[PDB]
Ligand SMILES: Nc1ncnc2c1ncn2[C@@H]1O[C@@H]2COP(=O)(O)O[C@H]2[C@H]1O
Ligand SMILES: Nc1ncnc2c1ncn2[C@@H]1O[C@@H]2COP(=O)(O)O[C@H]2[C@H]1O
Ligand SMILES: Nc1ncnc2c1ncn2[C@@H]1O[C@@H]2COP(=O)(O)O[C@H]2[C@H]1O
């Protein structure tokens with residue numbers, strides 16, 4: 001009940017904000033649908049809760065919640081459990097809506113994403129669409145090359161993703177160099193399919 | 202109502218603080234007028250609200266709220282939308298009152314400002330006033346040269362501005378080098394009109 | 403009463419979170435036992451409280467609370483009081499449960515621990531268990547070598563520990579170089595007993 | 604009333620904390636006296652309040668509250684107003700009680716202090732006490748030399764001081780080099796009186 005009240009109290013402050021700034025009706029509707037999909041009638045203060053625990057508890061929790069994701073990603077399903085845990089521990093759950101530009105080509109990237117559920121489209125400047133779904137990840141190439149996004153990525157459907165900041169990406173990969181190279185191999189091949197090559201990889 | 206109550210509860214803590222420290226009447230009046238102009242009877246916890254959303258939503262929101270500003274600035278009205286978005290996303294709304302010294306000459310600057318509504322006066326040490334208003338920006342030269350403010354800037358009227366920290370200024374400009382040079386061209390000419398020249402530009 | 407209510411209100415948000423994410427029964431039971439052991443029916447906002455005080459008060463407080471620990475550690479019981487205080491001031495109280503992997507071999511360490519009460523087991527990859535208890539500390543070697551954890555450490559019983567971040571470890575040791583070397587001497591000998599040697603030490 | 608209630612609610616959480624950790628009676632009494640002297644029956648959330656204002660307002664406020672201090676310090680009373688403002692803006696009000704060791708010789712310093720009201724004693728390792736009061740400042744030498752505290756400083760009476768972090772000390776002094784040298788001149792002479800000399804100064 002307390003968490004349900006929290007959700008309602010929050011959404012109310014959100015509605016009032018939108019009304020104050022007079023956001024268009026269709027946008028208010030999108031926000032409504034976003035809150036519905038992202039929090040599903042409940043609001044928690046995770047930072048506060050998880051912060052009251054300790055390393056092991058928090059690690060056991062994240063591993064439990066991400067079982068499916070871990071099971072659908074070739075990358076983690078075979079890797080060192082400590083690697084996965086190190087990665088899982090830094091993930092931020094996010095939800096994007098149909099048509100959202102999650103990543104735009106030519107810009108500098110600050111994060112990468114892991115797909116738990118949903119379908120996205122990888123779009124290059126020269127057209128050419130490639131779909132990605134459950135178990136796949138995207139947005140890693142720029143983090144590896146420290147260059148620019150090599151393509152755009154749109155949400156085709158609602159997308160439940162887990163993102164990893166560029167800083168946390170480097171921290172874990174600095175500790176597990178073999179996973180970095182695994183990311184490189186996949187990346188080199190990906191760039192090759194979109195007519196690109198980068199010596200950095 | 203909740204946001205209106207928030208505004209009232211806040212102002213009350215503000216009044217009590219001023220009374221405790223015994224700020225002069227005229228200052229208490231200025232504070233009253235400031236809160237009135239800045240929050241206009243409503244208080245929101247933007248950090249909390251926007252933080253519950255995601256990249257796209259937040260970007261759509263800021264773009265909506267800043268339509269006019271974007272439309273009155275030659276700088277953004279022609280630029281890459283992703284540039285504008287990158288810039289808009291880092292702006293902090295602020296309000297200054299008539300007679301306020303927004304920038305003082307000879308000091309190190311930590312931010313620049315974009316004028317949404319209001320008129321300011323650019324004042325040099327050797328006297329000479331130049332007015333700036335809606336659509337213009339100021340405080341950029343020091344950020345570019347990493348030197349000192351080349352002039353003072355006073356609020357002539359109430360001023361509704363959007364500020365950009367020195368750190369965010371460098372981050373976006375590091376990504377969009379052509380906008381940096383555009384800022385330079387305008388700056389070189391501005392310095393020239395106040396009898397100054399800087400090789401850094 | 404207020405602190406007791408806080409504890410109850412917190413645990414309730416914790417239970418609701420676990421229910422939302424559907425954590426297994428046995429895990430919910432572990433969480434229950436954790437909160438019981440860690441907070442013992444009371445919840446305080448230390449950051450807020452201690453933050454209202456000043457250096458001396460806070461230092462006197464931590465010294466009082468850690469009398470026993472200080473008295474059971476050869477390391478501090480003989481050291482400069484200002485050293486101990488510098489160390490105590492940066493400690494974070496934590497509680498781990500039986501079977502928890504506090505430290506895993508081969509990973510990068512971010513902290514070290516001081517044992518106030520409890521018994522842990524130091525386990526090497528080649529098997530070989532060594533017990534550590536009240537008065538002892540562990541997890542320091544990696545901080546000194548900037549290498550990898552040279553062994554794993556499991557909680558044998560409930561463990562009431564005080565941890566020290568890698569950053570605070572370097573700050574205090576940079577100020578008290580002789581304590582660093584004391585840590586080194588013990589470390590060199592410890593590595594030697596697990597068939598290891600590091601020139602860095 | 605709201606601020607008065609805040610003070611009472613806070614102190615209550617403080618009393619409960621001390622009771623939980625069982626701090627000695629005399630210490631609980633010192634804490635009582637500390638809260639009485641430091642907050643004088645009122646608790647405000649300055650960070651929140653001042654944060655709602657802007658540069659000018661906040662600067663006018665701090666300048667008002669620190670009029671006396673500014674008027675009793677040879678250092679600021681003659682300096683550039685923008686320098687004083689830059690300094691005042693970074694000060695943290697603190698209160699120390701009789702007998703407190705504000706600074707201990709031989710340790711690394713992280714801040715300096717300005718005396719608004721109270722008397723302290725500068726004590727060297729070789730004995731020798733020198734009193735300092737209203738208008739004077741101390742704890743600056745270590746910040747300038749990046750060395751160690753060259754003496755200890757005890758509160759003789761209750762002391763109402765304004766402290767300046769080492770980071771803010773460098774920021775302002777990097778902008779006003781002539782004030783740094785003024786600090787140096789005084790420092791060189793101070794060290795000379797306690798039988799010390801440092802080429803860094
Ligand atoms: N050929 C490809 N197949 C699938 N995904 C790709 C391909 N090329 C690029 N991508 C993804 O598109 C993303 C765009 O941003 P990044 O360059 O960070 O990382 C890129 C990859 O994650
Ligand atoms: N000739 C000018 N015309 C308009 N604005 C100016 C002129 N010269 C300087 N300025 C502005 O005055 C500001 C003072 O601070 P900055 O040096 O950061 O940046 C300067 C410009 O924004
Ligand atoms: N021989 C030993 N006896 C006791 N403790 C040890 C021994 N060897 C290693 N350790 C501890 O095991 C810890 C594993 O992590 P660290 O390498 O950080 O630090 C190590 C020491 O704290």
Ligand SMILES: Nc1ncnc2c1ncn2[C@@H]1O[C@@H]2COP(=O)(O)O[C@H]2[C@H]1O
Nearest residue numbers: 725741742743744745752753754793796
């Ligand atoms: N001769 C002196 N007279 C007054 N104050 C002094 C004298 N010598 C040192 N101090 C102060 O004692 C402080 C001890 O810490 P610091 O070295 O940071 O800075 C020192 C000065 O602020």
